[PDB]
Write an enzyme that holds these catalytic residues in place. Structure first.
Site, mmCIF file in Angstrom:
data_model
loop_
_atom_site.group_PDB
_atom_site.id
_atom_site.type_symbol
_atom_site.label_atom_id
_atom_site.label_comp_id
_atom_site.label_asym_id
_atom_site.label_seq_id
_atom_site.Cartn_x
_atom_site.Cartn_y
_atom_site.Cartn_z
ATOM 1 N N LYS A 117 0.789 -1.260 0.259
ATOM 2 C CA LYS A 117 -0.075 -0.216 -0.121
ATOM 3 C C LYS A 117 0.797 1.283 -0.022
ATOM 4 O O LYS A 117 0.184 2.272 -0.360
ATOM 5 C CB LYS A 117 -0.853 0.078 1.126
ATOM 6 C CG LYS A 117 -1.907 -1.373 1.405
ATOM 7 C CD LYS A 117 -2.891 -1.142 0.212
ATOM 8 C CE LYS A 117 -4.116 -2.198 0.559
ATOM 9 N NZ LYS A 117 -4.801 -2.559 -0.862
ATOM 10 N N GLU A 289 -7.090 1.443 -5.730
ATOM 11 C CA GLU A 289 -6.093 0.616 -5.928
ATOM 12 C C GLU A 289 -6.006 0.237 -7.271
ATOM 13 O O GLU A 289 -6.755 0.401 -8.234
ATOM 14 C CB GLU A 289 -6.324 -0.847 -5.199
ATOM 15 C CG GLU A 289 -5.234 -1.987 -5.579
ATOM 16 C CD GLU A 289 -5.840 -3.386 -5.498
ATOM 17 O OE1 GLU A 289 -7.321 -3.611 -6.016
ATOM 18 O OE2 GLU A 289 -5.081 -4.088 -5.073
#
Lengths: 668, 180
Positions: A117, A289
């Protein structure tokens, strides 16, 4: 021109998609399979096949060493893994590239770049997408919780600095409950896990999940395709997607498409992939994402862009530039896709079933319908693989045409032998919120707060179902009277003017009177007149009827002499018991005996030695699941569960000798 | 004398729907098929009162001559049905299979199931591994007209399957092994 031979490292419909594209391109395709997948469709469609390993995927599709042997054995030039198995496996791509085999998919830089992340968030900041700031510090005071929110934004979330599962989390909007939420969490959280440090960040309301696909070029170019709306989901897996969203106008599509490209061009993602955004109720789009792999939601965009994603990925991997420019990418109509699983939708929305397919017929005669399936009749579905049956794709010129065509395809789609989820798909697409578009990522959880129950019939639909069930019942009774002529014993057709039936549905008994006038049955259902016209071909799995001008398709799934008939109507199976007036009046004299359901107690059906037990206490068990294997007289006999549940106790172990009737395993 | 004389001339079907004792128990033994009704019908020569008087063994009515015993263990009854109404409904459908006399050909009835269709479902039923069993019934159901099969003695001698079905409208009898 292109490759001479490509190996596919996957199974099922995704392998079939590549095989079909290669054949269109004139490229030989090599398949791999496990011992149980040796008769699957993609193995037969491929030109060459190599068996890699046994049933469990870890030894057959994730065994990169055995696959490398297959790749060189067949002198394959390029490998296309599709998705799932080794599409993000860096060690596979590394050792594959070491042998100069062209890999079709991301390179290992893109896989690692989005490995976690932190790099993904940093890319979104550099590519300049969004990634809304939070508070880079701990909130300590009572006034900091509101003062910091005032500087960044309005909807503000209070959460623990580390943890989850409601560890002092509260949602706040104004300053009064932001102050209140913080001080409550900061004074009580210390009693849970010993930590009372709170952070604040910003959130969104009723989110929608929207994807944008990007096609990268090895020369530095990248184009973005039309988005996908992917909000209908269960257990964090999508089931229904729409391509031409509804939450975007022309300017929003361009604005977000350019940001998805900005991500791809800053890591040099010279592959095809997807960028996921969340949009709030106010049309504010936030980065979620970046995905590197052909998505399972790539067959719905193709129907409105007019592209072939596998063909394009192969040319890019060979080294050709993109064949299109952004000005040529447009929405040619609307397309909606539904995923069909071998799952019971009633058992907490999709509990896997186990079984073999006895009847299978795809709705390919209908306009605007494309079925992408990896199975054929006589295929088994098992616990080793995601229970996918097919992906059903429907397109049309407008939103109502694509949805109506989808409804028709689902009712003409024959799956028998396993439990499927058609009833759920058929009802969601016709839901008033779905047609209007008021869909959030938690849509199904608010529509079905107590679980899936099935389609609920209204007054007119019950009358049509009763008229169809009664007319079909009589149609069988009339067919039974048509014999060849016996010259010794003439047969006299009973002169029946009216059929007086007692038709039991869920808990009501209805009075239905039917008569035949050739191809049309005139049926009175509790005083309502209906006319059911058909050809009444009783052998076909799909029976087409017209009820007062209304076109219906029904399936008769079972019929018994005792009046039981199982009819699938609008996707839902209804159990109707049709008795004649006489049988119903006398049936009231029958004793209502109650028997015991003894499906949780699994006993040995045959003496012999137990050689395997698939379970331990706590293991989940599906219906049809193998539990124990007893082998006597040179023959492995599988003992399967008759109930969905969990194991409470394993009473006989492998190595034990058991007799007839001995208890093996006890289920909840 | 009539039941023996009629054998091979007309079919004789017997459904037992209650108790049966004494000499009555031999007529179903002379007819062609015997059916019973679960937990309502009995078939015994002497009652439990005689059995206990002759030999020192305890037995009740359902154990001595119940429908479950004759369909599962003695092999006398061909099939038991749940109740009187269901028993006669299935009996009518069974009747439709049989000729009226042995002078008649097997009945042929209107059929909508094309006689020349393929059944791809059969190609992969039989495993290549010699010690893996499979269910013969899947083959029987997929071949017969409209997948309707009338199974006889489902709970007795399960290693062999016998029953009635129709292929292209004509009644046929099916016999096969059950490797399961």
């Amino acid at each position: 021109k292109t490759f001479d031979k490509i190996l596919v490292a996957n199974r099922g419909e995704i392998a079939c998609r590549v095989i079909r594209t290669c054949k269109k391109m004139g490229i030989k395709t090599v398949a791999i399979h496990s011992d149980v997948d040796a008769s699957s469709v993609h193995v037969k469609m491929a030109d060459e096949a190599v068996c890699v390993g046994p049933a469990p995927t870890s030894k057959s599709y994730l065994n990169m060493d055995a696959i490398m042997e297959a790749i060189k054995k067949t002198r394959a030039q390029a490998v296309h893994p599709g998705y799932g198995f080794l599409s993000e496996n860096k060690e596979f791509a590394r050792c594959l590239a070491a042998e100069d085999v062209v890999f079709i998919g991301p390179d290992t830089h893109a896989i690692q770049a989005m490995g976690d992340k932190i790099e993904s968030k940093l890319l979104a900041k550099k590519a300049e997408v969004n990634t809304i700031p939070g508070f880079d510090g701990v909130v300590k005071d009572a006034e900091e919780a509101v003062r910091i929110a005032r500087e960044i934004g309005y909807p503000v979330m209070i959460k623990a600095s580390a943890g989850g599962g409601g560890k002092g989390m509260r949602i706040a909007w104004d300053d009064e409950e932001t102050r209140d939420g913080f001080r409550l969490s900061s004074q009580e959280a210390a009693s849970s896990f010993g930590d009372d440090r709170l952070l604040i960040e910003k959130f969104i309301d009723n989110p929608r999940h929207i994807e944008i696909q990007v096609l990268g070029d090895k020369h530095g170019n990248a184009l973005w395709l039309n988005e996908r709306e992917c909000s209908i989901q269960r257990r964090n897996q999508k089931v229904v997607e729409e391509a031409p969203s509804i939450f975007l106008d022309a300017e929003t599509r361009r604005a977000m498409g350019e940001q998805a490209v900005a991500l791809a061009r800053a890591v040099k993602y010279s592959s095809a992939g997807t960028v996921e955004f969340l949009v709030d109720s106010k049309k504010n789009f936030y980065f979620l994402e970046m995905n590197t792999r052909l998505q399972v939601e790539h067959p719905v965009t193709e129907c409105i862009t007019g592209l072939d994603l596998v063909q394009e990925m192969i040319r890019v991997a060979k080294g050709y530039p993109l064949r299109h420019k952004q000005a040529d990418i447009r929405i040619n109509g609307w397309a909606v896709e539904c995923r069909v699983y071998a799952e019971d939708p009633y058992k907490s929305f999709g509990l896997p079933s186990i079984g073999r397919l006895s009847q299978y017929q795809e709705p390919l005669h209908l306009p605007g319908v494309r079925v992408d399936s990896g199975i054929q009749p006589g295929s088994d579905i098992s616990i080793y693989y995601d229970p996918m049956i097919s992906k059903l794709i429907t397109y049309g010129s407008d939103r109502t045409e694509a949805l109506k065509r989808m409804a028709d395809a689902l009712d003409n789609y024959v799956i028998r032998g396993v439990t499927h989820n058609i009833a759920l798909l058929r009802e969601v697409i016709i839901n008033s919120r779905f047609v209007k578009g008021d869909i959030s990522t938690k849509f199904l959880s608010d529509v079905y707060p107590d679980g899936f129950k099935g389609h609920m019939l209204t007054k007119s639909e019950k009358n049509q179902l009763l008229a169809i069930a009664s007319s079909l019942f009589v149609a069988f009774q009339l067919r039974a009277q048509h014999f060849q002529e016996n010259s010794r014993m003439p047969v006299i057709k009973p002169d029946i003017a009216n059929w007086e039936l007692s038709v039991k549905l869920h808990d009501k008994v209805h009075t239905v009177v039917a008569s035949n006038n050739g191809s049309v049955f005139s049926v009175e259902v509790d005083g309502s007149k209906l006319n059911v016209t058909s050809t009444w071909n009783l052998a076909s799995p799909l029976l087409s009827v017209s009820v007062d001008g209304t076109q219906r398709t029904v399936q008769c799934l079972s019929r018994e002499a005792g009046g039981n008939m199982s009819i699938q109507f609008l996707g839902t199976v209804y159990k109707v018991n049709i008795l004649t007036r006489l049988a119903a009046e006398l049936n009231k004299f029958m004793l209502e005996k109650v028997t015991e359901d003894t499906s949780s107690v699994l006993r040995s059906p045959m003496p012999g030695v137990v050689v395997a037990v698939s379970v331990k206490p706590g293991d989940a068990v599906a219906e049809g699941q193998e539990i124990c294997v007893i082998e006597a007289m040179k023959m492995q006999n599988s003992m399967t569960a008759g109930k969905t549940g969990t194991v409470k106790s394993v009473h006989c172990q492998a190595g034990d000798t058991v007799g007839e009737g001995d208890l093996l395993v006890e289920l909840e | 004398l009539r039941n023996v004389t009629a054998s091979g001339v007309i079919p004789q079907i017997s459904l037992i729907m209650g108790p049966c004792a004494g000499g009555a128990v031999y007529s179903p033994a002379l007819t062609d098929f015997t059916f019973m009704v679960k937990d309502t019908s009995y078939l015994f020569i002497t009652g439990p009162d005689v059995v206990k008087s002759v030999t020192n063994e305890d037995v009740t009515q359902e154990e001595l001559g119940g429908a479950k015993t004759h369909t599962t263990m003695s092999g006398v009854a061909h099939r038991a049905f749940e109740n009187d109404v269901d028993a006669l409904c299935n009996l009518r459908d069974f009747f439709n299979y049989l000729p009226l006399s042995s002078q008649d050909p097997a009945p042929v009835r209107e059929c909508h199931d094309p006689s020349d269709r393929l059944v791809p479902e059969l190609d992969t039923i039989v495993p290549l591994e010699s010690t893996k069993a499979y269910n013969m019934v899947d083959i029987i159901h997929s071949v017969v007209d409209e997948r309707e099969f009338f199974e006889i003695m489902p709970n007795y001698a399960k290693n062999i399957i016998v029953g009635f079905a129709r292929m292209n409208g004509r009644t046929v009898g099916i016999v096969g092994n059950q490797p399961k």
